[PDB]
Design a protein around this ligand. Sequence first.
Ligand code: MA5
Lengths: 239, 248, 249, 252, 252
Amino acid sequence: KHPLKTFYLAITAGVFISIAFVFYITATTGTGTMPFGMAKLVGGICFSLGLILCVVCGADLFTSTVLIVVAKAAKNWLNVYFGNLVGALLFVLLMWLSGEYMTANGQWGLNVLQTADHKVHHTFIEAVCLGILANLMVCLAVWMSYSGRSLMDKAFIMVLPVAMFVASGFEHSIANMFMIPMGIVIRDFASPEFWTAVGSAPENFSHLTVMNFITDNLIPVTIGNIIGGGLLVGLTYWV
Amino acid sequence: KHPLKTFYLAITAGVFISIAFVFYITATTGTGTMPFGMAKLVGGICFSLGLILCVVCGADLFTSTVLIVVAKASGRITWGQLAKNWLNVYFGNLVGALLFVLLMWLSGEYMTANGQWGLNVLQTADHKVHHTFIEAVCLGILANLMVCLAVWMSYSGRSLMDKAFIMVLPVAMFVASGFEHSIANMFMIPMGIVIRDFASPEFWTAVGSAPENFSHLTVMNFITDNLIPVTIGNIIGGGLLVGLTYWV
Amino acid sequence: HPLKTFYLAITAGVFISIAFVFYITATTGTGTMPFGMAKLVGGICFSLGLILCVVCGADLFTSTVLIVVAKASGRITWGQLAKNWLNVYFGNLVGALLFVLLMWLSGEYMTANGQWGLNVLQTADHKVHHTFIEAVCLGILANLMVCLAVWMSYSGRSLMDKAFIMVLPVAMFVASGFEHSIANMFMIPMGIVIRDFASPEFWTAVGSAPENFSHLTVMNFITDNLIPVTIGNIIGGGLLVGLTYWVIY
Amino acid sequence: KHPLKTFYLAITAGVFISIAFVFYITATTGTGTMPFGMAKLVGGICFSLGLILCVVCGADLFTSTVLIVVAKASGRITWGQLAKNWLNVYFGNLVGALLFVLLMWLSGEYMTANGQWGLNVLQTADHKVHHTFIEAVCLGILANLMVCLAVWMSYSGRSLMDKAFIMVLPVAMFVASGFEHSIANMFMIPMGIVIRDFASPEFWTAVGSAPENFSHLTVMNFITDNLIPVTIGNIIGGGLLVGLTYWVIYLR
Amino acid sequence: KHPLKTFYLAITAGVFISIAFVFYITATTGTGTMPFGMAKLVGGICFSLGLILCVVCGADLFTSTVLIVVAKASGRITWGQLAKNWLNVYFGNLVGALLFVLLMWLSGEYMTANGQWGLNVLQTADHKVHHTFIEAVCLGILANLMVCLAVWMSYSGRSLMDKAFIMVLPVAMFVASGFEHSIANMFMIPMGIVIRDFASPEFWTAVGSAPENFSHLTVMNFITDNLIPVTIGNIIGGGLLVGLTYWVIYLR
Ligand SMILES: OC[C@H]1O[C@H](O[C@H]2[C@H](O)[C@@H](O)[C@H](OCCC3CCCCC3)O[C@@H]2CO)[C@H](O)[C@@H](O)[C@@H]1O
């Protein structure tokens, strides 16, 4: 009930979704030769860890449970959204300090750069629509989970729905709070050895900036997320 | 039993099956060098997402639960009764598919994997409009046999695990084998037509093809060459399982 | 009873055919893949069929013989445990054949540039080239697995238990090329049908001719596979029945 | 109780473990191109079927349930009691494995995949007879640690799902890693000797080898270089866990 | 509660985690041509066996159950109470790991796959002593976060499937990602040091390398460049979660 509690559980959820994207990046590092959809699918299955963490442990992931809230019957969102952000950024910091970006001869870092960079090149509408698509999947996953009895039920019913949105490259704003900043940090602070390893340079990723993150992704994706969850809320009421 | 509620649940199921096909397209994108059956099997496993969604969330997928209706009524119903909501669920389902088509087109998703995502839809849609009426009805009955069986098995489950994961194999079987489900095609084929009709020139370049390569992808061909025979096959397929179940 | 049984037998023939269709789809185009891996996957898909039989209460020839012995409690005779075997066997056959017609009508055989169809031909053909004794032993092997799978399934207390306990034992027999008579009622005839009806196009895409599969005939199916395999399946069941009987008494 | 019941159940487990190894051979046939550990892992997963059969159906696999026995008695039990049926089970296990060797030979399975199935058996059996005595013991210790742990975990299960699938990882681990289980080897190595001695000229031509290339595969080598030291290790590994169990139960 | 029992269970957890890393080495042997991430993920999934063993059999793995201890007192316990038997458990853990090093060494396993199994250990171990101190601490924080969370989730489970399988993903995650767990490293790094110091000439030949290419693989480099910083990190990782847990519980 405490707003402090919620804030701590939202930070926790931010850390959890970062764990998920880290797993995704790890799983998909060096998979450029493998068929696109298969590599992404495996990445997405791995990503589901994060949602499983949130549900089993009771963390508060921005809007993920909106259908639960309606079923058992709201500016708390600002609290959760920002707590989420704080947790993601703390994990960005921890991941940077661990040296992980040099994993697989720097390919781990490159995977983050290219994944982060992809995410700031949508138009506003497609970003919104991918935000809609992503949260539809998350909210549905969380809903199914709640009809679950056992741990197995609650965790594993969420694997397919999550893997689908992730493998499909749909956009989740909180997940993005880890990924794009992680990309920005690497782009700005990577050693010369990393660039040599990876056959690239900072200027090849010139759109990976804070500004571009906020405007080309975070805003439209957050809007899209909100709409996605809203569509489900509004479908729920009629029923 | 409210007519408008099932309409919303039908629209929901349409979105659910569209989600299934999108997932299928995603998983099978760029699988060209992969053994045909292996790629198709994995796509089929992913596709099961849609039926898991339908059943667990309580959505209304055209005829998928017909076997249940019988046993629930302890065997008390007639022809003219078992299809009151049928055109209701059907067109509702269609709206769901079409809506998700619009949304998927707006997402710019067809440019995924250098346009290979889009190309996958083109080819998948294209394949579904080159069937003989007969073989489409047959693929149609084969598909619905698998869906109805999957749904009947689900209903004997207790846990969430039971209800969901018993449907994976039978669903994945019909999808990997390229059997025909009318509603799922309401997304796939119009998705292909939209892409064909409205794809940028850069897509065509990236992929290395042309709109003239998919000259059979028209709205009319969709209706007459697929939707009609497949729907009829879906119906006969569900027909058989009903007659068998009855005598029990 | 007998009429209800017959239909549940047709049902199982349908189910077992679905199993093999899935197997063929899964293994189509897997010539570059390691043999065992491709076959293992096909066998996991094939398990659908038995899952279908057990969960929907369908009647697959002899598959439950162990459950019946257990239910009798050792108060049963071998002479009673075979009245409706011929009924089930025949019903299974009808269902398998009906599915052969449905698969042929679908034109499914052209899938993957004729490769699906070719899969069936090569699979069917291989099944008609055993020695009689090879066929019998392969039949013993397949039915040990089927009977064990079904037996484990019956100790289950959820859908998950009953269905998934069978995946491994079924995959093992299918992946291993063991011989199950009912499954064969679909595969070999499906192959005979494709061979004697395939279009010139199929043969061109496939790169073969009907004369490459000269052993695929109804009579060769009956004598070189079905008889010995059926005998084998029966013996495989008998061994387990005999074993169970001793452990009980 | 009753030596005869136990004997038949042991025959059954010997068949069960033979089924396990057949599945492993089938799954790993033609996996020369695959990464080694990946092929071995998949075979190991397939192999667990054998232990699943033994536990679910109630068969008696040499020493596999020794920790259950100790726990059910609350450690109020002597080694003589623990080992009371070992000779009988070991023998019965052997009879079941040899019966399965015969059936597999009569099946003609060795020609599967143009003889590669049979070749896989030969190479697998041959590898198992080239250990030093100490290596074979330690590999035996390792194998039976895993089997007994697997069976231990299975007994805390409350559903068929629990009991079966909890053994997958620990069995796959011992198998993928090439640890040595004596009963499993009663199928595998004699299967090798049999193929080596009775394979057709067509087989040898198909796989491009000759019986001369597998001259270590004899009954006496099987017994002295594998079965004896592996059986010793198996017992030692079970023993180590039994010791551990006694003590953890003793410490009130 | 008994100290000697705890010690035996800590030796046991050391064995279980050693088993986990052996399985990881087995599955990833010869995987150099697979996508890096796929191979490590598979390895990581195999690795989860170790933790499944610890939880199912009630062995004591350094700090892994710290969150559960906090929950069982509704957060009404002190830091000093939490670390009460950390020394006992840490040393038991170590004894168990080292024992399994000795056994794996005597098994001759390092020659598996033409020495590739042993090469896999060398390179894995060697990697683990080339972090900066800060990196090793952070990698240690990261590994123990995932371990403590997995165990926490496992404790809300009711069936055996629940308790075991809920742990697969978070364990594979830390392992596939190359995060650093101190007890696991008590097997891995000493295993590499042993292979380096005692490998036959046949090994280095089959493997195309030499001991001088692994000059950092020493007991001292193990302690100072990995064990100390990684252990500190493991502790900080558990500490973070325990602190979060107090507050969640201290706010209704
Ligand atoms: O010497 C006769 C003894 O017979 C039984 O003990 C057997 C017991 O039944 C028998 O299973 C056991 O076998 C020894 C271990 C096996 C294990 C496989 C390899 C061959 C040897 O050896 C014991 C000692 O002979 C009785 O239980 C003993 O009380 C009795 O003293």
